[PDB]
């Protein structure tokens, strides 16, 4: 097998999302920019390492890449590569806007092409099964569109960002019903339980992208999106002992994207003088959870229980 | 078996919702305030009686309470208690704002905790079944959130009300698809057919809550919500002979929440000079239907076919 | 059987939608009004011919009409008659507003009654099956409501148009999840693959109706709707070789409604100076695709492969 699973890309993804969330606090806190820079540099280094390892996989492990691409469930994790690429471009935009725009466009085109080629292929039927409805399916159809929308908004293409954001939002609200019904009916295997944290992602990622596109204006839509996001957060907090029933694992980084988007939207709301206490609580909670994830990853690295 | 099914809480629930709907017509009609006061007092008395009966059930019938709480389908009716509590708090707000706030907060916390502890347990799987997808599932995930949002808006917490309203709205949008698909596929047993009236509830309850939070402004969202609510109302009117295939019963009070929310939104739309004729028709239809429900309940009480 | 399938009504439907889209370009081009008039006249003639054929069917083939009405899947195509009637009324509104209003009201009442009588009857269950979830179900529940909303907006009834538009939009959002899940799970049979083009319709029909009701003011909702519409357009472009695996057929006109609504929304967006390049591309693409459909229909007619 390949040492690095494609699902490990959630580490740089979450770190970059948290870096952007901290970047949004540049003015109110002098060390916020330093924290954002540190997080962004760490995320960029991790993303570079993972991209090189995935290139090695393509060159010498193309059979596994083909298997995961053709699988009805594992293909969704390949969408983490363009998402993390767009996030790294967003990070670099504070230093080199040209490289940032190049990376953002590369990631947007890559994720759009991947969704067109694979997510639409499922409509043919026969390969996708009722037990293939996993939370990871948000990554190609939902998370990628929101990330592309936010990145394009960062580049100034606000109308194209609106298009991508709407695509992601409607895909999210069109897929989540069947996903939740399947979770209610057919449970979820322990090895796939860590991916339940992706259920927290779309609700907060949508509001983060919307606030990025519309210059951080807190409309009724953003408040509604936090309503659902906090409902989901409470639901998953009550289920966390069941998610980690078999123990802590690197798969819990799936919560990282949701937590970082929650922190970003929390900064946006705090800037708007709306639900300031709730925003502070959400930001602190997301930061503490991501710090615990980082500590767990460090412990796994030291103990050697990280790579496969 | 306890003489009071947990589903009988829809009587005070609908009566209180209609009382608030009439309260909204205080200025336009001099006896509207008297009608609202009468409805609110009757609803409060019925709610107090039912709360005492349920406390008796807890003290001496805790086995049945546990069975209904752990059931994947019957648990949803326990959410009627916090909803009725919040509605009674809303009623009392016109007399004792402090008691109203206390009841509203108690109900909001209770329903949020119930949804977190039970609606999220279903995701574990193995207990919820495809045949457990019933209209009653709206009560914990949807109706409770809308009622909490409207109550908080009544207290002045408009942003928290927006959060709760969005949670309820997105929960409704996420659950209704599978519910309607199941209804199309697996029919519905006669004993559960009376609960089909809850399908009418979310569309009108959402617009009622939205108009409560945003100071009764008729936005495009309210018009859209009435569009879908009237579509569903026509759909259920065509199905009413099928719903009462085995005769009228106290289960028809499930329509009461939808009718009362329709009346409240009708008052809100009439105040805004938007579709005044349709608003008057909806208000009159809701009042007449709830009066018919009250007459049926009185007939059952006299005949002795009310308690189980 | 009867020579003309009820699904052939998509020809006048698509032609009329494209005629309205071109009519929206009256001022920009001198020949735009002439093109719109030609398209509208051809669509009206085809609709008159098909209505006469369907009247002949009712008088002398009522058994087939009853069979398609009672079928859980074939009934949806009967909604094409009121939809095309409303579109023809919209066309005639430029010449005889009174006849246009009469036709629009007749079509609105007919489609509303059909949905109430049949779409709601499916909730009884036992006749609708998991394999009856086809894209054609959009026609009675979604496309009809959007067309009625747009037609009513054309007549000046903007609030009633908003009601119908919201009904259609929420019906679309409530049905698409299970439809896409079924498509992913079970492959659509080749004879029903041509109807996959109806999946493209709702996303663009919704934005077209919204622009018609709100005076073509490009709002965030319109941009979101284009986002999802273009996502679905790419998805179906990837799938087109699979849709026509067994060859081209008159069933491909199902794409006509989606393409024409895309063209109409393209005119609306170009008017507002929002994504002008994308608007031009969408308009040209829709016009070229509908022209290809027209050429295919002409070739089928010449080769005697059009009627059954």
Author numbering:
A (entry chain B), B (entry chain A), C (entry chain C): 6 to 313
Paste lines from the article.
We successfully elucidated the structures of all four samples with an average resolution of 3 Å. The HiTehA purified using GDN achieved the highest resolution of 2.9 Å, followed by those purified with DDM and LMNG at resolutions of 3.1 Å, and OG at 3.2 Å, as detailed in Table 1 and Figure S1. The four structures of HiTehA closely align, revealing a minimal root-mean-square deviation (r.m.s.d.) of 0.13 Å for all atoms, except for the sample purified in DDM, which showed a slightly higher deviation of 0.26 Å. In general, the structural integrity of the trimeric arrangement remains unaffected using four different detergents during protein purification. Remarkably, none of the detergents tested appear to induce any significant alteration in the position of the gating Phe262 located on TM9. This observation underscores the robustness of the trimeric structure and the stability of key functional elements within HiTehA, even under varying detergent conditions. The identification of a linear density within the channel cavity across all detergent conditions suggests this cavity can be occupied either by detergent molecules or by other hydrophobic molecules such as co-purified lipids.
The SLAC1 homolog, HiTehA, although not completely biochemically characterized, is identified as a transporter protein involved in tellurite resistance and adaptation to environmental stresses, highlighting its role in bacterial survival through regulating solute concentrations. HiTehA is a trimeric protein; each monomer comprises 10 transmembrane helices (TMs) connected by short extracellular loops and slightly longer intracellular loops; a short helix is part of the loop connecting TM2. The ion channel architecture features a distinctive organization: the pore-forming helices are positioned at odd-numbered TMs, while the even TMs collectively form an outer shell. This outer shell contributes significantly to the overall stability and functionality of the channel, potentially playing a pivotal role in sensing environmental changes, responding to stimuli, and regulating the opening and closing dynamics of the channels.
